[PDB]
Write a protein that binds this ligand. Sequence first.
Ligand SMILES: COc1c(C)cc(N2C[C@@H](O)[C@@H](O)C2=O)cc1/C=C/c1ccc(Cl)cc1
Length: 192
Amino acid sequence: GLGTARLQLVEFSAFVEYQRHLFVHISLESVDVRQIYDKFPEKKGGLRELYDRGPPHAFFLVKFWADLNWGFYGVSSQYESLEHMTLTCSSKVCSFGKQVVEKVETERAQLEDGRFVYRLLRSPMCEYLVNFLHKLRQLPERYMMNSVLENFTILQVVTNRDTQELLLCTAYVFEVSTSERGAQHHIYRLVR
Ligand SMILES: COc1c(C)cc(N2C[C@@H](O)[C@@H](O)C2=O)cc1/C=C/c1ccc(Cl)cc1
């Protein structure tokens, strides 16, 4: 599972509008973090520096095989925790390791069924990704899509807003699936 004892990601989907097409969706083996340093900014606030501060158990890699065979572009996600917190979520989109978008959002805890849930429902997909998907979709071969996506990564850092503690850091890498197989993901622990 993707989480610590303090915070867990229970669901994530990126979609375009049953009547929904999921590009990627989440409803453990380990990888050496130094093998993916280059995929993210190596200067201040990079993966190496984040991993240096720790804690090591908060670091995950997700590989997505996206369904690009298909409106409103949206994202939904749910985190959970047993302690009431305010979350700061920083997403960085990187192209050839260079940061091209950073988005910072705040999410407040909602008490629900004995636990705290941090829910985004039908949130607008960020403009950079919408425009990228519009172009990626036109490609005639899956292998060409994979060539374009091998340089595309996303780093997501979730911190406790009030303490500045890192709660969860996830690196995302992308390939394309077939429409027959549909979307898939695998989650890995980042170790050093
Ligand atoms: C998993 O990485 C993401 C993370 C961490 C976050 C947001 N989010 C959250 C909000 O900021 C919203 O604006 C947004 O786009 C989107 C993605 C990815 C979107 C996507 C869609 C299709 C394909 Cl093939 C690949 C990726």
